[PDB]
């Protein structure tokens, strides 16, 4: 039934044609069960083991490096016995790394908790219905409940489905709807209709929502909707349909390989144009079948030279280490890719209760009457410190500590708070903290009484377990609570009947202690207590009292206020009719006003500061809460989201108000407003989405089940360490410490990491440039292969793979948190940096090819072959005449190729020092600042030797160690790089900007 909250009890029964007295028939149940399905949230299992892997290859650069791997195997057959000892060493290491990351890849992702699983933990296994099937109530499987069922709920019960309340059995039905509002306070339901068809959950006080629980009372209702058609279902649907977007960095990479596929494809065809001068001459020394082999080989070369493999492993390494670092800072990162995105945050959306606040109601102000005299009435106001349920704190009179026991009014105020209470305190020994037992607004009263210690009870030596209710028990010993007149909706107050301890039932001196909404209570008072005396309530006194209640109830504190009173001469136990509550208000009459207490859920101590720091980093903070607007705005002023006196008419909205604005208005509203109150779960995700429609990287921080959709939606969802499992499993990070401050340090860590990732992302890609310049030259220039695609891999995995990981340790800046969030679009390489790496790029390309063509012409132990007979090195065994000198097997010699690889390596070992800073001369910025980089270059050079000496290696790589005569040469061809880029680093920093 849609909109059951807007209809009457009769209309709802009619709608399904059911009897409140008998319930559905076995037929009706079967028909409904088929028409609506089972009352269950569809389970969503994670991707299978097979999927995870396949998804691994889904990457373009990965599918291009795989295609080349195949062509590298198809042509792995065509080979003779000269090198028949190593023919498939390439098709091996090419797919070895592919399946290496693929496998490991799934070793991180397949390890994740499911949010819907956690969510279904709010689904009860059992429910209670009245089926025509039989007379007494049946207890069946919740999933077997259907719309139209007549259900019964009782205190402690976890509501089975979205139900329209039919009849409330007790005086009141109290419900905890924190899974939908994040507020634990008991909501008092009723059965009357709620007209507005757009009423938010907080407004549907005639409905019971699946997943919530009964705090107190017994009720009968009719099921309106089940399964995914419930409020918890919408939460479930927003979490199912999600799939976090690709981080900003991943997009830059996906863009890179998006072009690499175009550039390479274009370079191949490019070289093709330079191979038309051999197609003309009518020669049969190379058929088409053979003629194609050339291209498929040069292609596999370009691919392995372009695709900067190894990077995917360098990144994962930096992040993994960062995560360990952040964990030390109390920030558990569940999604590595989010670490980078957190530094790029411009807006932080935050839940209020239990996130910005402690979620522990605390009484911080209270007053009693001082003296009365005609139109003059003065109050004794006090303040109480303490923001938790712990009995730690003091009572302040004018900011100066005092003893409550001195004031008689406070002895009575405390007596009422201890007696007119159904809650208590408890010390959780396992957790080492004090926790409430029962309602929060009542435990605040319990806690206040322990702090006041109006009878000066000796408590310093009691165990924390016994300290929890010490002072309350003392008071419970003075008066016996005969019975309590439970709260009534038409009274807004509650009272308890008490007789003196150790007196006869006939004895005189009984009292009623009242607690309630100030208006009603104060109006039933005809007297005001003064110390231990009592004088008549008069217009002046009443106005004095109501004036301060008004200030406290709506100010910069907007506190929940309770008036405490007592009936000095209550009715005789007998003449009281307890079974009829409409008679209670009259019993709670002729009252003596005693005092007022003011409470609120405080903010966490370190939140104002944390938000100021966020502001410094150019990050805005917005509040989105299910709690009411008045207290939401109050808290916003207390933590600095609003000015103590700022006008917020257009800067704060309730969910309902927001829903009224048209779409374009809603959007703009998210840019202007900083406080959204009395919202529903989907309102939070919608706000985050609007924020994202302006291309802002938004973080969401919360602790409730109602925060899940938004947490899921935000680029960076951050859950409170001591919050719900649902929130945690939907987040990218968890603040084990529960401090907002931690978020700030995580953003800082996020900015620093990316800065370092920026360098080694350039370093590696840079290297890959010089490589392609090489393969390009020795492709349209005729020359033999200076470097084979089976060597590059090792270089881009171990040679550069080490300096990279070393760069991820560059010392971060100081002004890191004084600059505004960087744009998601900010490119890695462009402008002068595009050219600077273009020069170094082509350079290495010819720096290697030059060392190869050097071992021939201007060489030593090599044939001084002329450049012409060098480029035509092919025509040797076919054209002996023209081209002739030595043996035709000196080209594929392990010398020329082993001369270019030494250059490439020596260059990149110098380029890693050039990447220690964008526009900074290595001389100005000591290349030894990063000790891990120096030691890194060593391990690479040593491994460059090891890949020569130990024969089992240079065999597959086709390399041969060089001596001083040759090695000294490399140092003089690569070393000049600390100049080109050195001069270039001067240009930008002296002719562009700094
Ligand atoms: C792997 C190696 C290379 C050389 C490659 O093809 O990189 C190109 C390329 C695809 C881009 C370019 C390279 O393009 C050129 O250098 C122009 C053509 C000259 C080649 C001559 C043939 C020998 C990057 C690498 O380099 C330079 C030095 O100019 C910079 C940048 O890349 C980034 O910002 C890094 C993103 C991870 C990208 O223009 C980028 O395309 C984009 O979409 C960007 C925005 O990304
Ligand atoms: F704790 Al909330 F909205 F769920 F402030
Ligand atoms: Mg909360």
UniProtKB/Swiss-Prot annotation:
Residues involved in Mg(2+) binding: 351, 353, 703
InterPro entries in the cross-refs: ATPase_P-typ_cation-transptr_C (IPR006068), ATPase_P-typ_cation-transptr_N (IPR004014), ATPase_P-typ_cyto_dom_N (IPR023299), ATPase_P-typ_P_site (IPR018303), ATPase_P-typ_TM_dom_sf (IPR023298), ATPase_P-typ_transduc_dom_A_sf (IPR008250), HAD-like_sf (IPR036412), HAD_sf (IPR023214)
Keyword Iron recorded: no
Segments traversing the membrane: 49-69, 90-110, 254-273, 296-313, 758-777, 788-808, 829-851, 898-917, 931-949, 965-985
Disulfide bonds listed in the record: 876-888
Cellular component GO terms held in the UniProt record: endoplasmic reticulum; endoplasmic reticulum membrane; endoplasmic reticulum-Golgi intermediate compartment; H zone; I band; membrane; perinuclear region of cytoplasm; sarcoplasmic reticulum
Active site: 351 (4-aspartylphosphate intermediate)
Topological region Lumenal: 70-89, 274-295, 778-787, 852-897, 950-964
Membrane topology: Multi-pass membrane protein
Result when mutating residue 789 to L: Almost complete loss of Ca(2+) transport activity because of reduced Ca(2+) affinity
Catalysed reaction equations from the record: Ca(2+)(in) + ATP + H2O = Ca(2+)(out) + ADP + phosphate + H(+)
Subunit text: Interacts with sarcolipin (SLN). Interacts with phospholamban (PLN). Interacts with myoregulin (MRLN). Interacts with DWORF. Interacts with VMP1.
Function statement: Key regulator of striated muscle performance by acting as the major Ca(2+) ATPase responsible for the reuptake of cytosolic Ca(2+) into the sarcoplasmic reticulum. Catalyzes the hydrolysis of ATP coupled with the translocation of calcium from the cytosol to the sarcoplasmic reticulum lumen. Contributes to calcium sequestration involved in muscular excitation/contraction.
Entry protein name: Sarcoplasmic/endoplasmic reticulum calcium ATPase 1
Native species: Oryctolagus cuniculus (Rabbit)
């Amino acid at each position: 039934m849609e909109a059951a909250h807007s209809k009457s009890t009769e209309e709802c029964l009619a709608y399904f044609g059911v009897s409140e007295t008998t319930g559905l028939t076995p037929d009706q149940v079967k028909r409904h069960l088929e028409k609506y399905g089972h009352n269950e949230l569809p389970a969503e299992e994670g991707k299978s083991l097979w999927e995870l892997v396949i998804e691994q290859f889904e990457d373009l650069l990965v599918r291009i490096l795989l295609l080349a791997a195949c062509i590298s195997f198809v042509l792995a057959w065509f080979e003779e016995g000269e090198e028949t000892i190593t023919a498939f060493v390439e098709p091996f290491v090419i797919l070895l790394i592919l399946i290496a990351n693929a496998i490991v890849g799934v070793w991180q992702e397949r390890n994740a908790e499911n949010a819907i699983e956690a969510l279904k933990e709010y689904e009860p296994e059992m429910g209670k219905v009245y089926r025509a099937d039989r007379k007494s109530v049946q207890r069946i499987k919740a999933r077997d409940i259907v719309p139209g069922d007549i259900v019964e709920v009782a205190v402690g019960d976890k509501v089975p489905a979205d139900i329209r309340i039919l009849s409330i059995k007790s005086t009141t039905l109290r419900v905890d709807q924190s899974i939908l509002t994040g507020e634990s306070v008991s909501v008092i339901k009723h059965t009357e209709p709620v007209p507005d068809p757009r009423a938010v959950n907080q407004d549907k006080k005639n409905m019971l929502f699946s997943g919530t629980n009964i705090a107190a009372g017994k009720a009968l209702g009719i099921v309106a909707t089940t399964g995914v058609s419930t409020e918890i279902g919408k939460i479930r649907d927003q979490m199912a349909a999600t799939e976090q977007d690709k981080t900003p960095l991943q997009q830059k990479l996906d863009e890179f390989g998006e072009q690499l596929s175009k550039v390479i494809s274009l370079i191949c065809v490019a070289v093709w144009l330079i191979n038309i001068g051999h197609f003309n001459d009518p020669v049969h020394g190379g058929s088409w079948i053979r003629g194609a082999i050339y291209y498929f080989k040069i292609a596999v070369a370009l691919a392995v030279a372009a695709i900067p493999e190894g990077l995917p492993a360098v990144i994962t390494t930096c992040l993994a280490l960062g995560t360990r670092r952040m964990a030390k800072k109390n920030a558990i990162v569940r999604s590595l890719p989010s670490v980078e995105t957190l530094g790029c945050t411009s807006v932080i959306c935050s839940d209020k209760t239990g996130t910005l606040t402690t979620n522990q109601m605390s009484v911080c102000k209270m007053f009693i009457i001082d003296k009365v005299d005609g139109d003059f009435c003065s109050l004794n106001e006090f303040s109480i410190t303490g923001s938790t349920y712990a009995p730690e704190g003091e009572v302040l009179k004018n900011d100066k500590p005092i003893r409550s026991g001195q004031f008689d009014g406070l002895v009575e105020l405390a007596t009422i708070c201890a007696l007119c209470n159904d809650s208590s305190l408890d010390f959780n020994e396992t957790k080492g903290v004090y926790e409430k037992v029962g309602e929060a607004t009542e435990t605040a009263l319990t806690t206040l009484v322990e702090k006041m210690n109006v009878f000066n009870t000796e408590v310093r030596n009691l165990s924390k377990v016994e300290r929890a209710n010490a002072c309350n028990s003392v008071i419970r010993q003075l008066m016996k609570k005969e019975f309590t007149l439970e709260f009534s909706r038409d009274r807004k107050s509650m009272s308890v009947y008490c007789s003196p301890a150790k007196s006869s039932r006939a004895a005189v001196g009984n009292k009623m202690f009242v607690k309630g909404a100030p208006e009603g209570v104060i109006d039933r008072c005809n007297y005001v207590r003064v110390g231990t005396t009592r004088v008549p309530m008069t217009g002046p006194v009443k106005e004095k009292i109501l004036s301060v209640i008004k200030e406290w109830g709506t100010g910069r504190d907007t506190l929940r206020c309770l008036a405490l009173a007592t009936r000095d001469t209550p009715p005789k136990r007998e003449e009281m009719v307890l079974d009829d509550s409409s008679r209670f208000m009259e019993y709670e009459t002729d009252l003596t006003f005693v005092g007022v207490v003011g409470m609120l859920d405080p903010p966490r101590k370190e939140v104002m500061g944390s938000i100021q720091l966020c502001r410094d980093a150019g990050i805005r903070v917005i509040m989105i809460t299910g709690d009411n607007k008045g207290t939401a705005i109050a808290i916003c002023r207390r933590i600095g989201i609003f000015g103590e006196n700022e006008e917020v008419a257009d800067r704060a909205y309730t969910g309902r108000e927001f829903d009224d604005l048209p779409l374009a208005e809603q959007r703009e509203a998210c840019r202007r407003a900083c406080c959204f109150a009395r919202v529903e779960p989907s309102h939070k995700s919608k706000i985050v989405e609007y924020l994202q429609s302006y291309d802002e990287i938004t973080a969401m921080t919360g602790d409730g089940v109602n925060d899940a959709p938004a947490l899921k939606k935000a680029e960076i969802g951050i859950a409170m360490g001591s919050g719900t499992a649902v929130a945690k499993t939907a987040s990218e990070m968890v603040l084990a410490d529960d401090n907002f401050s931690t978020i700030v340090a995580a953003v800082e860590e996020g900015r620093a990491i990316y800065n370092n990732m920026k360098q080694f992302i350039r370093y590696l890609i840079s290297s890959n440039v010089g490589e392609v310049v090489c393969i390009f030259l020795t492709a349209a220039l005729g020359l033999p292969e200076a470097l084979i695609p089976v060597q590059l891999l090792w270089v881009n995995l171990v040679t550069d793979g080490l300096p990279a990981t070393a760069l991820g340790f560059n010392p971060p800046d100081l002004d890191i948190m004084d600059r505004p969030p960087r744009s998601p679009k900010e490119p890695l390489i462009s402008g002068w940096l595009f050219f600077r790496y273009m020069a170094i790029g082509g350079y290495v390309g010819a720096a290697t090819v030059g060392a190869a063509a050097w071992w021939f012409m201007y060489a030593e132990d090599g044939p001084g072959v002329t450049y012409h007979q060098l480029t035509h090195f092919m025509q040797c065994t076919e054209d002996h005449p023209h081209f002739e000198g030595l043996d035709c097997e000196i080209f594929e010699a392990p010398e020329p190729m082993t001369m270019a690889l030494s250059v490439l390596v020596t260059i990149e070992m110098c380029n890693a020092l050039n990447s220690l800073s964008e526009n900074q001369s290595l001389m100005r910025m000591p290349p030894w600042v990063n000790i891990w980089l120096l030691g890194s270059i060593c391990l690479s050079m040593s491994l460059h030797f090891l890949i020569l000496y130990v024969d089992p290696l240079p065999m597959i790589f086709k390399l041969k160690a060089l001596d001083l005569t040759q090695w000294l040469m490399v140092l003089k061809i690569s070393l000049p790089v600390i100049g080109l880029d050195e001069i270039l680093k001067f240009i930008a920093r002296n002719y562009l900007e700094g």
